């Protein structure tokens, strides 16, 4: 609809497409099976955000109902977008930067914004896998290292911050991270973490070495395994003590939370991360298929499994939170029992849980001034089920504490950390496909130097930039970039893909070309959401961002062991030079989409 000239003789033509696949068998890779393509697309949508990000948002935002919100927004943003992304790579036969430079070559910023976004997400997601395989190496020993406090020098008492905090909370901040008190104070490289980082990048270079003919078998294993383990964790989780008391708590509807501008944003920004939209990897994976492959049936099957898995991991996660909260309620209520037995001389099995409150008043009516020194607790469930931990603590200080109280402790910890590893790995494959393929269409290296050499300089180049998160303050740097980065770029890049296919390429040329592949020109549901609904629905997510950014009082959490009233929380209000980092990681992937479009329109004219 927008007047771009010369669209033909820049893209392949429709009558020429039946001859192009019997010559792109050379000089272009190809899938072996159809299941090799669906398993590497499920692994790119499902990873590490269904574990510690979705089940918190499913409950904290009026769970049981948030399902509703998350659903609608899905079959509205997600479906339409994913479909249009699968059908644009199969037709134009290029990667991510080659598709948007084929249609109006003055655009070209959507390819460079997808490469900068895939570089920054895959930079810090390879440090989370670095932390995960550190907890995997510290398995294979029956007293796990996060099970008991160490002794200090004289072997008479514990270490001081292991006694005020928890031993698990001590293994993360002092024996894994060696964290500092601020983001300003940084130290050395912390060798162990560095070795682990090396291992992670090395394991990543072995799987994605020769492009797509290695990540095939890789995807197979790294895509099934995760599922089987997740299952095994369901029939163990639903048996322990306190599951079905953490499943009910997840699915309690609170309809007041639906009328909130902050609910529909993170429900909207999870859909763009429950899938892998606006990343540039799903277009490069779809471009290897046959020309008559059904891409309408693939986008429904991929989105049904992604909507079913996000509920399925939340059942497994909140079964373990329900077991940990029932255990902490019983090891609290047995100490309120133990106080009066040690003060009023009663038999052992005397004064259980059924008779606590009536035996409170039998003692104070027997003899006063002996109840006044008694310290009791006000501990109760829905206060042990209601901690707001999120993002890394749901696996390193919450899930791994409930594993130590199970029967076979060093076996449920090996099975738990190899699964997370697998998830991370599949996501990594995705992001790597995202940064290598646009770096070949730019031709930064000569057409010598085969596929082993370009991937080796990406895995070694992103390794040296990953030294930031190995410092003492390296966990404050990783909690900074994540959110911001992701969110902003994702939304913005996602809007201009829906715009430049419908109004620059033309939705009438699109329909014809699609029909040429499958038959049966798409329904009234596809024509409505492509044209009016999903571009409008992606603007109110972009409008709600600058509503919740201007009033949330941007802060961050520190540890600070030498601090009065220590183990509660802390928020100490980021320094003024950190806005340089926020502008850099969130702004310049957003600004290369207009920035190249202004440069190309003034170089010619």
């Amino acid at each position: 609809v927008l007047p771009n000239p010369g669209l033909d003789a820049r893209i392949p033509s429709l009558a020429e497409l039946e001859t192009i696949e019997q010559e792109e068998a050379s000089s272009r890779p190809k899938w072996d099976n159809k299941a090799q393509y669906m398993l590497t697309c499920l692994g790119f949508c499902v990873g590490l955000g269904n574990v510690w990000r979705f089940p918190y948002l499913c409950q904290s935002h009026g769970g049981g109902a948030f399902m509703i919100p998350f659903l609608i927004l899905l079959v509205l943003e997600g479906i339409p977008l994913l479909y249009l992304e699968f059908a644009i790579g199969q037709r134009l036969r290029r990667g991510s930067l080659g598709v948007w430079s084929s249609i109006h070559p003055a655009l070209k910023g959507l390819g460079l914004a997808s490469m900068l976004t895939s570089f920054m997400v895959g930079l810090y997601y390879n440090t989370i896998i670095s932390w995960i395989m550190w907890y995997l190496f510290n398995s294979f020993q029956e007293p796990l290292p996060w099970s008991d406090c160490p002794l200090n020098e004289n072997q008479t008492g514990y270490v001081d911050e292991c006694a005020r905090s928890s031993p698990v909370d001590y293994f993360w901040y002092r024996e894994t991270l060696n964290i500092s008190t601020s983001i300003s104070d940084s130290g050395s490289i912390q060798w162990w973490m560095l070795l682990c980082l090396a291992c992670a990048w090395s394991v990543l270079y072995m799987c994605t070495i020769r492009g797509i003919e290695t990540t095939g078998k890789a995807v197979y294993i790294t895509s099934t395994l995760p599922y089987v383990v997740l299952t095994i964790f369901l029939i163990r989780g639903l048996t322990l003590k306190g599951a079905t008391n953490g499943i009910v708590f997840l699915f309690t509807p609170n309809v007041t939370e639906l009328a909130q501008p902050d609910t529909w944003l993170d429900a909207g920004a999870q859909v763009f991360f429950s899938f892998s939209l606006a990343f540039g990897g799903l277009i490069s994976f779809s471009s290897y298929n046959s020309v008559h492959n059904n891409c309408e049936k693939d986008s429904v099957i991929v989105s049904i499994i992604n909507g079913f898995t996000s509920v399925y991991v939340a059942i497994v996660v909140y079964s373990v939170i329900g077991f940990r909260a029932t255990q902490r309620y019983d090891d609290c209520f047995s100490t309120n029992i133990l106080t009066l037995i040690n003060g009023f001389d009663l038999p052992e099995g005397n004064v259980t849980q059924e008779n606590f409150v009536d035996m409170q008043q039998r003692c104070n009516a027997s003899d006063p001034a002996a109840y006044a020194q008694l310290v009791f607790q006000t501990c109760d469930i829905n206060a042990f089920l209601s901690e707001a931990v999120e993002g890394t603590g749901l696996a390193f200080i919450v899930f791994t504490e409930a594993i130590t109280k199970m029967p076979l402790s060093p076996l449920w910890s090996v099975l738990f950390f190899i699964m997370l590893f697998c998830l991370g790995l599949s996501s990594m494959f995705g992001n790597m496909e995202g940064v290598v393929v646009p770096l070949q269409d730019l031709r930064v290296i000569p057409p010598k130097w085969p596929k082993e050499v370009l991937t080796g300089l990406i895995c070694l180049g992103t390794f040296l930039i990953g030294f930031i998160f190995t410092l003492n303050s390296g966990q404050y740097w990783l909690s900074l970039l994540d959110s911001y980065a992701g969110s902003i770029p994702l939304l913005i890049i996602a809007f201009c893909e829906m715009f430049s296919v419908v109004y620059v390429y033309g939705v009438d040329r699109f329909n014809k070309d699609i029909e040429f592949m499958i038959g049966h020109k798409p329904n009234i549901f596809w024509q409505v959401t492509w044209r009016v609904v999903s571009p409008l629905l992606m603007l109110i997510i972009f409008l709600f961002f600058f509503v919740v950014e201007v009033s949330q009082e941007l802060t961050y959490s520190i540890w600070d062991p030498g601090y009065e009233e220590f183990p509660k929380s802390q928020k100490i209000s980021y320094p003024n030079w950190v806005y340089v980092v926020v502008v850099i990681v969130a702004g310049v992937p957003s600004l290369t989409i207009p920035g190249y479009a202004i440069y190309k329109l003034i170089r010619n004219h």
Binding site: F137, C199, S202, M206, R210, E452
Partner: peptide
């Protein structure tokens, strides 16, 4: 022994051997 160092050890071994068996199969495809 510092038991996490031997697991890491064994894993690194395999990783490296694999990368090598991977860069020499790619020279037997010319």
């Amino acid at each position: 022994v510092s038991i996490w160092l031997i697991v890491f050890g064994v894993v690194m071994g395999v990783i490296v051997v694999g990368i090598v068996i991977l860069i020499f199969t790619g020279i037997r495809d010319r």
